[PDB]
Design a protein around this nucleic acid. Structure first.
Ligand SMILES: [Mg+2]
Ligand SMILES: [Mg+2]
Ligand SMILES: [Mg+2]
Ligand SMILES: [Mg+2]
Ligand SMILES: [Mg+2]
Ligand SMILES: [Mg+2]
Ligand SMILES: [Mg+2]
Ligand SMILES: [Mg+2]
Ligand SMILES: [Mg+2]
Ligand SMILES: [Mg+2]
Ligand SMILES: [Mg+2]
Lengths: 100, 95, 52, 315
RNA sequence: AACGAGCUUGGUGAUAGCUGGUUACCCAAAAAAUGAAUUUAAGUUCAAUUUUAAACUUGCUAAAAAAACAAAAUCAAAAAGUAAGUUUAGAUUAUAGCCAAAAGAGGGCUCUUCUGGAACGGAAAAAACCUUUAAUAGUGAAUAAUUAACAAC
RNA sequence: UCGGAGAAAAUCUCCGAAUGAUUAUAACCUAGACUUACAAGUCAAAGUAAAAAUAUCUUGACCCAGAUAUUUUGAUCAACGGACCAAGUUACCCUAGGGAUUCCUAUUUAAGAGUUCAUAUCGACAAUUAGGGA
């Protein structure tokens, strides 16, 4: 219950944090965003939350998605909503340990 | 609770707390999770892991347990080789 | 309908874990991780615990 | 219904990829994160097509292509354009010349001699150990006669003290034509000295087109120079001084890790203790400690402790 | 001389989530009837609110673009008007409202959410409508709202 | 008691669960979070270990009793936060309290009745900000 957006766009998120909960795929995992068993979306890197539309391409193996995707109007393609976390720090830095 | 006993005139400990919770000298209380030994066959592996852990108590729960036990249970105990020796004090606590 | 069984490791350890089987299906046996041995070993059904 | 259907995953995939690159009103991931020559070419193609043996090998899937000839052809025909990218990719342009881009033209060649006829070609992005580069390499770029030139070696990333700097391993000046022994040795050759645990330092070999003989007295260095501090250098200032008579025409860069020879360089001639660097990550994030960590496991208290040993205070 | 089970004394100051009562002054602040569990809905415990002291730093309004559904509740950089806010320690009471106005949902009423009110003045009398920052002495003054209104070829 | 669908979140409109079969057998440990009065309930990087990644699809506390040799199992406790185990009846009653004690009719309209003729006496459809009666 209480499915919704736990973190809104622009917020400084720390790793592991949960961004949104959903019974069905209202949003899809984006960049540096993980997917949970229950389909909740959590931050894989500390950063800033960003929502953006993007084209949807499914795994070749799944029959339902390849069939639906294939049977689309040549002109255009369907889209989806994605959630991304923008990493805000470098992985690490080099420091002087000792002079020998 | 017994506030003034007929024989000694003191408060009395509630021995249901003494048999369920551990008090760290800093003021914290540890407990188990209800149901951690029940129907383990139908519980998920993640659920069972959460149940096995030793957990802290809230401020109001700790305030209640402090009322239900006497001072003897709040003293500093110097047990040799104690496995909670390091958890009786707080470090780097600004609050 | 189904029953709760106790699969016991055949690696010589006493490690056991409970599983479910269908009263109709034959006695069960599975490969499962034994922490004491730190290897996969056969677990074969020895006893029933309850009927669930 | 009027429009046809893709009927193939590949056709949809390619269409989708192109659309993402195109700009859109709505936010997207990318925002946040002559004639005679042609006739000659066609004639060769017809000759190759006419050859039955070539067709026979192709239909037998036994034919092969000579990489050696293609490599030479690639360098002459279109190699510089690719060479520009690998310079852009590594950021050479955005570092040496503050974002100015110069297309390389001369197919410059460098190789380090190892004992005997085993030359290690220094291409773009190659990996060369400091040990191999102990001595200066052979440079050949077919300058042709009456062709003044100048050669420069630079480490880009270094200068332990100064972040925005770049040492000059050696600068030959007034190089007349292909021959390089005639260059004025403004700076002797220093062996590579990438500090231990500092990652991959990228070294580049850049050549400028020398219009008129200019004395680089302000750039000459006391030979031998083992006072590393003096090797401080920044191309932009140097190029700006001589930009009138200096225009770059060649590139060649390798990246090298630390090696035992580096210890020799720091001690024997640099005459100082070698610095050691280690990759250090920031400490993990913990929410502010609470007096009552409600519902948190016993591990909570360990997260905020400094010393792993017991203390006894007044006791 | 009050028998569905006598009367007297003691147990006994029986117990009563129920009814009633609970004695000088002054200053100050101040909720609720939201939520949750309860043989629990005439009670109580917790959350939430309020409050007192302490520590130190951002808070209130407003808040673009842009986002989550869409032509305003979340969220919300800079500002600007302003003085509050978070944490620590202690603590009860409260958990049944009332009427007006606005939008819905059931089906006039009855639930739910949003706003306001509790005159000593005006509307006749008038807790709930309108005017009204606290409370003082004066045989001063300017004002607010203010049950009144002026058949038709 | 809990879950699914509508009203659309307050009471109303509907379906199901006290599991089921499948199975690759799904480990230990540990940052950060969701949810929440408490209690219970969710998701999960990194590390290690097994293997050669994967469990897929659609729920009841404490106490107290057990079972094996640490490992585990006990509820239509369904009044579903659950008293270890108790029903009727009272008009013979008691105490502490809270309460209460369609069809007319008057207007407007006027097809049709009244031999002829709307309104002598009446009268369809309707109109009144109109008056009463499991
Ligand atoms: Mg009494
Ligand atoms: Mg009561
Ligand atoms: Mg309210
Ligand atoms: Mg509940
Ligand atoms: Mg009960
Ligand atoms: Mg601001
Ligand atoms: Mg809790
Ligand atoms: Mg992992
Ligand atoms: Mg009950
Ligand atoms: Mg109940
Ligand atoms: Mg009778």
């Amino acid at each position: 219950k209480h499915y919704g957006i736990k973190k809104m766009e622009g917020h400084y998120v720390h790793a592991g944090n949960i961004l949104g909960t959903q019974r069905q795929f209202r949003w899809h995992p984006g960049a540096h965003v993980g997917l949970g068993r229950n389909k909740c979306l959590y931050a894989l890197e500390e950063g800033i939350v960003r929502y953006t539309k993007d084209v949807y391409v499914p795994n070749p193996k799944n029959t339902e998605a390849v069939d639906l995707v294939t049977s689309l109007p040549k002109g255009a393609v369907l889209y989806k909503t994605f959630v991304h976390v923008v990493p805000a720090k470098p992985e690490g830095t080099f420091k002087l340990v000792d002079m020998l | 609770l017994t506030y003034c006993s007929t024989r000694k005139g003191k408060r009395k400990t509630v021995k249901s707390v003494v048999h369920r919770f551990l008090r760290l000298h800093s003021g914290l209380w540890l407990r188990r999770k209800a149901g951690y030994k029940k129907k383990l066959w139908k519980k998920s592996t993640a659920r069972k892991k959460r149940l096995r852990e030793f957990v802290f108590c809230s401020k109001t729960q700790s305030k209640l347990l402090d009322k239900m036990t006497t001072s003897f249970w709040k003293r500093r105990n110097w047990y040799a080789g104690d496995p909670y020796q390091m958890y009786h004090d707080r470090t780097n606590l600004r609050v | 309908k189904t029953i709760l069984v106790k699969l016991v490791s055949q690696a010589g350890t006493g490690f056991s874990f409970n599983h479910k089987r269908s009263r109709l299906r034959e006695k069960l046996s599975l490969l499962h991780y034994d922490p004491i041995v730190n290897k996969k070993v056969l677990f074969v059904e020895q006893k029933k615990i309850r009927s669930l | 219904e009027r429009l046809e259907k893709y009927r193939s995953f590949e056709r949809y995939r390619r269409r989708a990829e192109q659309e993402a690159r195109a700009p859109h009103w709505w936010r997207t991931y990318r925002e946040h994160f002559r004639t005679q020559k042609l006739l000659e070419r066609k004639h060769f193609l017809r000759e190759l097509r006419a050859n039955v043996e070539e067709e026979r090998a192709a239909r037998l899937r036994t034919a092969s292509i000579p990489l050696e000839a293609v490599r030479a052809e690639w360098e002459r025909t279109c190699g510089p354009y690719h060479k520009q990218r690998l310079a852009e990719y590594y950021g050479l342009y955005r570092d040496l010349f503050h974002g100015a881009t110069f297309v390389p033209w001369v197919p410059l060649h460098v190789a380090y001699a190892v004992g005997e006829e085993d030359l290690i070609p220094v291409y773009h992005g190659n990996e060369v150990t400091p040990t191999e580069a102990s001595r200066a390499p052979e440079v050949t770029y077919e300058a042709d006669k009456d062709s003044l030139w100048t050669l420069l070696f630079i480490n880009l990333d270094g200068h332990l003290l100064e972040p925005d700097a770049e040492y000059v391993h050696w600068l030959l000046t007034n190089i007349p034509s292909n021959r390089v022994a005639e260059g004025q040795e403004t700076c002797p050759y220093l062996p590579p000295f990438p500090a231990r645990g500092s990652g991959f330092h990228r070294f580049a070999f850049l050549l400028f087109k020398q219009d008129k003989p200019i004395n680089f007295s302000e750039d000459t260095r006391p030979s031998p120079c083992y006072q590393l501090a003096q090797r401080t250098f920044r191309t932009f200032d140097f190029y700006k001084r001589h930009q009138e008579a200096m225009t770059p025409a060649g590139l060649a860069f390798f990246q090298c890790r630390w090696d035992d020879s580096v210890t020799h360089t720091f001690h024997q001639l640099l005459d100082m203790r070698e610095p050691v660097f280690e990759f250090v990550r920031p400490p993990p994030y913990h929410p502010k400690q609470k007096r009552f960590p409600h519902e948190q496991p016993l591990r909570y208290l360990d997260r905020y402790r400094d010393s792993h040993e017991p203390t006894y205070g007044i006791y």
